[model samples]
Target: MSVIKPDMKIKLRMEGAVNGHPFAIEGVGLGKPFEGKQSMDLKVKEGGPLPFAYDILTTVFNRVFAKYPENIVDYFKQSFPEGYSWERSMNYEDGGICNATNDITLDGDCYIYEIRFDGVNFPANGPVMQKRTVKWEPSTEKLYVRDGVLKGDVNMALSLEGGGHYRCDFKTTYKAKKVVQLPDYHFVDHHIEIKSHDKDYSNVNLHEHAEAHSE
Candidate 1:
């Protein structure tokens, strides 16, 4: 019983797959201020450490810039639009550091100086010493950070418009309270898969227990 939107597109309130079950699940979160919750106090942008901001240098800037698309993944379109930087380190644009000349233009060595391990089980006892580092952003942005709540279980794999596979389950908090602030260093290393949006109610308009099922 909570909702209050202004520009709400936050989803996952499934609850529409009752008796028939051809493929249904809706949870429930229909419109503006009907059980939405938006308070704001989940910091870690100007107060880094990582709770949400596509950490681990976001996959080391997508494994060596993949030739650079200014750090793709729609730069976090699933609204993971985190903006971390070394003047926005996708290799920089508004300043410098975007060298390429080595495909025939001159010699070819786009950039192969190494020094990246990428945590979680890297280098056990192999043998390496490549070089490349500005060091994964170890500075700037802070005020308070002491919690990492980017919990999970907000599934969505819909194939329904009127007749088919449905498996939606996301209604354990958040219709809003994230004004997009995730960047302790994201010039696009990578961070994705966080979507939100409404179906027809569009923004908010469904609360009769918001029921629906099949034939």
Candidate 2:
């Protein structure tokens, strides 16, 4: 039951009503290796404004980032080893953290960022602050995270028709273990030779039956 997956892609799917609107949405993960349990609470009041479909998506993102803040920093550190240098303006061929788009294969929203340099010169301007944005897609949602196991349950009310309620639950475990060792055992069979009227043999083992034989 140790649901831990290092390579497993953390995908999410939920089907329920939202603000009186029947919604069946799914989300794909941009990052990996979630170690903690993912859970959220959502609700909608009748006659009240409906929550944006992507609101819950962002909630999950915030939870993940807070739990593993390294995810946000590591992305930049690995992407730019020496740190993003300055150059007034040039044709940047590298992935400049663009917003998400409707890719045919992708059925979820994704997280992207806009890079901004604090200082003017490269190396001299050491600090670079990046902003995160969730590209909300009607088809699905996406979250960038860092963990080994991804599991959670969300119970909430959806506004559909006059009023409706529903719940969402998902669990994904990974098998990342490389090596495993197990103990060896031999099987043995035995047949009862003596009849016992007062006792049952089901609970009796070979060692436990020694007293009965001696008696």
Candidate 3:
């Protein structure tokens, strides 16, 4: 794996509906969903043309990229500063796990990239922003593959303007069916790891009290 260089540029166009209201948003940055969690793991065991999980994830990501680009990168940096990495075994593809390295750069001097695995075009059945359900579990998993093309847009401002800032990556876990606490262990681990590698570039988490949740 190579370090995400600051010079690369990525752009993504988004169009969808939230609560029957049509809207469009765009983003630019460096990050890709090269692979995603298996549909089964994401609770979409039944294969179909429209996987709710995949659609939901894409929509939420786009919204956040457009509305809270800076916060998103900060969240990832604080939670997984080393940058996220994944690997899988051919024999146990479903059991594959994702890992992150705490080397994230948010100082307006680094570039982070993301790819949308399902391509850049927003789906017709994409998520809506109007219904209350949108606020309930705003995020979802697309699908898991032994390997697949990476997809998703990066927050350009976070990568370029606020290179050293922190953005919160929001997630809603279903076990409890609510948006609970920030993944503290994941955040702390990444922070420590990054500091271990480069003391100068690593910074403290700033948004300790920045979070929103719904049940």
Candidate 4:
């Protein structure tokens, strides 16, 4: 039997772009770059060369700016009806990077949210850098399956304030081709299939099998 190892490379696919330039988000493992398969008692320690959250934010900002360079202020004003502001100081002054936070008002209410850009890890180490935080409402639009394991609901409305909104999920995969699969069951069930090696039935209904196999 071969051990299933932890693949250290993480990639992000940025949507909504033009002119041969989309956003590029990449992360590399810093410590224990590999994992052993089938060894329940195995342990390893690792860190990441994570994608800088600011880089991604800037990329998104630039894309929007190119479309409405003169109306940048107006764009934000429309998206955040209540109010918004960027953080004036950095968490680590020696690093010389500005940490951002946004204050937002929705439905006559106000809230605060924080933004983080870094690679995923089991046990996070050191002071995790925070890039930006914005206030927005998370709406219930669609259910989400993450890394083919965890599941959650997506709030799409909150993202409308920006030029566009997206719910980002990070995962590690060995296969070269990736496809989203609809499960026979709801997201709460542990067996829902979101991504699969089988590509033929990307849209096929799996509910029938669930009915036949129900206890």
Alpha-carbon runs more than 4 Å astray in model 2: 1-5, 34-53, 60-215
Model 1 poorest ten-residue lDDT run:
98-107
Evaluate model 2: give its lDDT. 0.22
- Candidate 1 lDDT tens digits, 82-195: 211111112221121111111101012111111111112112221111111111221111111125322112232223234343232321111112343322222212112112
Separate clash counts for every candidate: 25, 13, 45, 4
Evaluate model 4: give its lDDT.
0.21
> For each candidate, what TM-score against the reference?
0.15, 0.21, 0.22, 0.19
For candidate 3, write residues 115-157 as lDDT tens digits. 2222222234322111111112222222111122222221111
1-215: candidate 2 lDDT, tens digit per residue: 12223222224333333223433334433332243222222222221232232322232221221112321222211221111111112111121111111111112232222222111211211111111112222111112222532222222222232333222222212111122121122111111111111121111111001000100
List candidate 1 stretches off by more than 4 Å: 1-150, 166-204, 208-215
Cα lDDT tens digits for candidate 4, 1-215: 01111221111221221112222322211111121111001111122122122222321110001111221222222333332333222222122233222222222221222222222221122122332312222222122334563222322211222244323331211111123232231211111111211222112111000101111
lDDT of 2 at 137: 21
Point out the higher-scoring one by TM-score: 1 or 2: 2
On lDDT, the stronger of 1 and 3 is: 3
Displacement of residue 72 (Cα, Å) in model 3 is: 18
Which sections of candidate 3 miss by over 4 Å? Answer: 29-184, 188-215
Candidate 3, TM-score vs. the true structure? 0.22
Query: Which TM-score value belongs to model 4?
Result: 0.19
